[PDB]
C-alpha cells in the first residue's frame, strides 16, 4: 500500500493496519497475564 | 443503513458498529475470565 500512493494516502491505510496489530497484540498479553496466575497458584500448591 | 444508504456509503458505516459491538463482546469476555478464575479458587477451598 504504502508503496502505492503518497504519504497523504499511505497514512490512512497504514493507520488502519496499526489499529488493528494493536489490539491483537494487547488480547495477547491480557490473555497471557490471565493464564500466568493459574500457574502461580499451581506452583504455590507445589511448593506447599 | 442498508436502505438510505447506497453500498460505497453503507461500508463506512457499518465499520463503525462492528468496531463497536467487537468492543462490546470482547469487554464481556475478559470479565468472564477474571470472574472464572475467581469462581475456580472457591471451588478448590470447597474440594478441600
Redesign the interface.
Known amino acids: 500500500i504504502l508503496s502505492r500512493l503518497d504519504p497523504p494516502e499511505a497514512e490512512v491505510q497504514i493507520d488502519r493496519l496499526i489499529t488493528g496489530r494493536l489490539q491483537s497484540l494487547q488480547?495477547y498479553v491480557?490473555?497471557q497475564l490471565?493464564r500466568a496466575?493459574?500457574i502461580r497458584?499451581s506452583a504455590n500448591l507445589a511448593a506447599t
Do not use: F, K, S
Open positions: 488480547t491480557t490473555q490471565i496466575a493459574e497458584a
